[PDB]
A paper describes a structure:
Recent work has shown that the metal‐dependent protein phosphatase [name] counteracts LRRK2 by dephosphorylating Rabs. The crystal structure of [name] reveals a structurally conserved phosphatase fold that strikingly has evolved a 110‐residue flap domain adjacent to the active site. Cellular assays, crosslinking and 3‐D modelling suggest that the flap domain encodes the docking motif for phosphorylated Rabs. Therefore, [name] has acquired a Rab‐specific interaction domain within a conserved phosphatase fold.
However, all of the structures are identical with only minor differences arising from flexible loops and the presence or absence of the third metal ion at the active site. Phosphorylated Rab8a (pRab8a, GTP‐bound) from the recent structure of the pRab8a:RILPL2 complex (Waschbüsch et al, 2020) was docked onto [name] using Haddock software (Dominguez et al, 2003; van Zundert et al, 2016). The structure of MnPPM1HWT‐LD with 3 Mn2+ ions was used for docking with distance restraints applied between pThr72 of pRab8a and the metal ions of [name]. The structures of [name] with two Mg2+ ions failed to dock with pRab8a at the active site, presumably due to the density of negative charges in the absence of a third metal ion. The model reveals that the extended active site cleft involving the flap domain forms multiple interactions with pRab8A within the [name] active site. Overall, the crosslinking data and docking model are consistent with pRab8a recognition by the flap domain with phosphorylated Thr72 in the switch II motif oriented towards the active site for dephosphorylation. We also performed docking of the switch 2 α‐helical peptide from pRab8a with MnPPM1HWT‐LD. Overall, the complete 8/10 docking solutions of [name]/peptide and the top 5/6 docking solutions of [name]/protein suggest that the flap domain is very likely to contribute to substrate recognition.
Residue numbers in the entry:
A (entry chain A): 31 to 104, 142 to 182, 235 to 512
B (entry chain B): 34 to 103, 142 to 182, 233 to 513
The structure:
């Protein structure tokens, strides 16, 4: 039904890039994989740095989207956002254009007060904004082709405080005098296992008589019927023994380890927007009941520290973090920025370009390779480098 | 009524006769009972307790401490009963048997890659659950009154496992530093789980409650007006027009030590309470409670502990009037006045903590330092010396 409907918004790259229609096509080169950076002739707020590169060939379009502007609540609200789309570009494009409007609307309900701690009203506003964005996608689903879904990582600076709201598996970290301050956590079948099992237990019909909510160390085989095995339930952190009993032969709700962890054999990320009609392969079981649009929000008070020109906030999609650790990013940032004149305004964009290049690697004979012959990232990669000096009181 | 599953009593290691128990239950004098010096506990653990100031005729705290045979396994436990002493008494005798049996399923292994620690944790988690299931079915044949919280510790193969299902608390004091070893399970700390369940299963509210949380009691006058609220998916607050459903009593009400689920109870985990209902109604509370504990591990081999490094276990009778910092300050000023070789050290430290929470009674209620109100609750304190857990 949705493939019969027009697009809500046309596909494109982040609008602040200012790319023509021909530059967009030139960027979608899976073999050359050109790293796009912000033109010096265009400045982002706070001289924010940005860089991106398309995937190595798994989807025709770059499915990351990004938005950055200064909102006005009828007070100023700086806004940065990254969306990692999957199974289509539609949700990430829609989110990159409309979520900031939901945030502005929710903040407007509480702005007289900003002038229960106020920080909890801003958190509540951001949480309501994520939900209302997903609700809008849900009902506009029937008039427009809003394909797939997306993760959502946004940050606002409001009255001297950074709010980092994450619903997905992108990541935000602060590098301050060389130390790593994490500002987000990822939501996967692994990190959300107990919530997912709890829902499956309380609402068994969501399992379509195809899955069991119990976790096992490996796939349970029919020949193990009547035998003892380790299992883990929703209220357990550890493992205990159990007699295998018919029901345990169903496919597990949670399966796989780390980046291979999956819910109902389908998805490896459990929060974001879209995916309303997503189904398990070869069945009619819906995935969305196990997904959530609700972000985790973390605050960084910019007043409690005097920030140098090399103290930055990094936002990136998993195209960076899947091959670079927080320590490699910290090492790279602190190694690069002291080579740029502190007054150079293109200097955080070059830092973001350096991060993308280190994760993308170079195209060798057997694929993309980074340092230590390691495999380079074949994904879309998008990176913000936000200089925290601009938030100094 | 039904026969008792066990006779009421006080911790066995107190070596009390029946006549000493009756004398100890003085709501006016409130004598502080301590481990006799002639009686040594594992690791020379200190223990002291005192009865409440009048809310229940019996002391509803219970405690048990022994060496389990699996390999040997040191075991300390504290239970804070409510609405009767039965559940606390049963748990103080039978939870160690459930723990012992769960550990026997995995003891060979201890001598996807599952770390051994996770097998111990899973064994404790299952033992709590199996204890509550035994209470649930023996409930019908024995008078096992009320419910109880459960805080237990085991030392197994060089590691401490602290498992908590309630609002008692365990902290380590190590070279003056406070090391928390448990978290409390209240309507407040468990709000999102509780709202989630009420939302997934609205019939549990019995058409008398709403799962939404509000900064204060929603009243008639607010109907149709804007008001802050918090749902299961929110940490912050947002505005909302009050509808007639928002007028029902909230599933979660109050804050801090005054937070309550279903207008009835201020702790959300433990054992028993299978038949606990909302007053004057057939709405059951137990679907919102959980017997599942949180387990924290302390590796004794990573630190060479001194004679004053201790693990404190106590029911809320202590923590409701003394912060972690006061307890730390109390222990670090008391113990340096005792010879490190004196086995009675930690018992005396335990008694000093109970006295500091209980206070002195005059004409203005029980008073502790700076004229603060003393604790009128049952109080039970363990002082576990970590020096006896040192490697080699
Ligand atoms: Mg005995
Ligand atoms: Mg000794
Ligand atoms: Mn993607
Ligand atoms: Mn990912
Ligand atoms: Mn990605
Ligand atoms: Mn009690
Ligand atoms: Mn309490
Ligand atoms: Mn108590």
């Amino acid at each position: 039904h949705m493939s019969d409907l027009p697009l809500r918004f046309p596909y494109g790259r982040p609008e602040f890039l200012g790319l023509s229609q021909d530059e967009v096509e030139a960027s979608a080169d899976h073999i050359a994989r050109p790293i796009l950076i912000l033109k010096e002739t265009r400045r982002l707020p706070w001289a924010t740095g940005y860089a991106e590169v398309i995937n190595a060939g798994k989807s025709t379009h770059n499915e990351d989207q990004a938005s950055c502007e200064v909102l006005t609540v009828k007070v100023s609200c700086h806004y940065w956002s990254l969306f990692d789309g999957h199974a289509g570009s539609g949700a990430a494009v829609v989110a990159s254009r409309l979520l900031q409007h939901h945030i502005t609307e929710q903040l407007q309900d509480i702005v007289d007060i900003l002038k229960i701690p106020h920080e909890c009203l801003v958190i509540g506003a951001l949480e309501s904004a994520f939900k209302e964005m997903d609700l809008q996608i849900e009902r506009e689903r029937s008039s427009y082709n809003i394909s797939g879904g997306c993760t959502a990582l946004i940050v606002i600076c409001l009255l001297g405080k950074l709010y980092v709201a994450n619903a997905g598996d992108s990541r935000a970290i602060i590098i301050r005098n060389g130390e790593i301050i994490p500002m987000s956590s990822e939501f996967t079948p692994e990190t959300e296992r107990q919530r997912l099992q709890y829902l499956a237990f309380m609402q068994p019909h969501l399992l379509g008589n195809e899955f069991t909510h119990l976790e096992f160390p490996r796939r349970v085989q029919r020949k193990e019927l009547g035998k003892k095995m380790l299992y883990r339930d929703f209220n357990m952190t550890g493992w205990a023994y159990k007699t295998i009993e018919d029901e345990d032969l169903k496919f597990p709700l949670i399966y796989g380890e780390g980046k291979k962890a999956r819910v109902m054999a389908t998805i490896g990320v459990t929060r974001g927007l879209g995916d309303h009609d997503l189904k398990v392969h070869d069945s009619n079981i819906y995935i969305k009941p196990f997904l959530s649009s609700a972000p985790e929000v973390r605050i960084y008070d910019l007043s409690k520290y005097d920030h140098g020109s090399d103290d930055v906030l990094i936002l990136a999609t998993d195209g960076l973090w899947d091959v670079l650790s927080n320590e490699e990013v910290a090492e790279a940032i602190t190694q690069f920025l002291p080579n740029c004149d502190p007054d150079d305004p293109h200097r955080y964009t070059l830092a973001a370009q350096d991060l993308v290049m280190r994760a993308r690697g170079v195209l060798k004979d057997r694929g993309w390779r980074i340092s230590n012959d390691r495999l380079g990232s074949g994904d879309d990669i998008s990176v913000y480098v936000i200089p925290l000096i601009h938030g100094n009181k």
